[PDB]
Amino acid sequence: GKRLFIIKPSGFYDKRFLKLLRFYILLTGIPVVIGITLINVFIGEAELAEIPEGYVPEHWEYFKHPISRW
Amino acid sequence: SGYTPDEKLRLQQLRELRRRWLKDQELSPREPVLPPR
């Protein structure tokens, strides 16, 4: 019993801003994380090998990760 | 010499006003009205 009123400033607006910021970050953070995991699990990284004779590669074929090549 | 009677009247009025304010600071049993989850 005998509870008092604790006077504090309105935390509704700051909490609303934090909720909006986390939601708008996550809204594209979840798809990009899912995309990176699907790239690394299935497609995967490249394998280093010597240059075949008479064959010149593209410039984007000089890199390892699929996203870097893209 | 303590207070003047004028100051005593002022202190009594301010004290009863302050006690009314502190009584109003209490919480009714329904407060806070938390929404259902």
SS in 3 state form for B1-37? Answer: CCCCHHHHHHHHHHHHHHHHHHHHCECCCCCCCCCCC
- Method of structure determination: cryo-EM
The helices-and-strands tally (H runs, E runs) of chain A is 2, 0
**Chain B residues closer than 8 Å to A11 by CB:** none
**8-state DSSP, A42:** I
CA B22, distance to chain mean position in Å, is: 3
CB contact under 8 A, B25 and A5: yes
Give the SS3 label for residue B23: helix
Residue with tokens 């809204």, as numbered in its chain? A27
Going by C-alpha positions, the residue among A35, A45, A40 that lies closest to residue A69 is A45
Count of Cβ atoms closer than 10 Å to residue A61 Cβ: 9
In chain B, the largest separation of any two C-alpha atoms, in whole Å, equals 63
**Chain B residues closer than 8 Å to A2 by CB:** 26
Query: In this structure, are residues B25 and A4 in contact, taking their beta carbons and an 8 Å threshold?
Result: yes
**Chain A residues closer than 8 Å to B25 by CB:** 4-5
Query: In this structure, are residues B11 and B3 in contact, taking their beta carbons and an 8 Å threshold?
Result: yes
Rounded CA separation B13/B11 (Å): 6
Count of Cβ atoms closer than 10 Å to residue A69 Cβ: 13
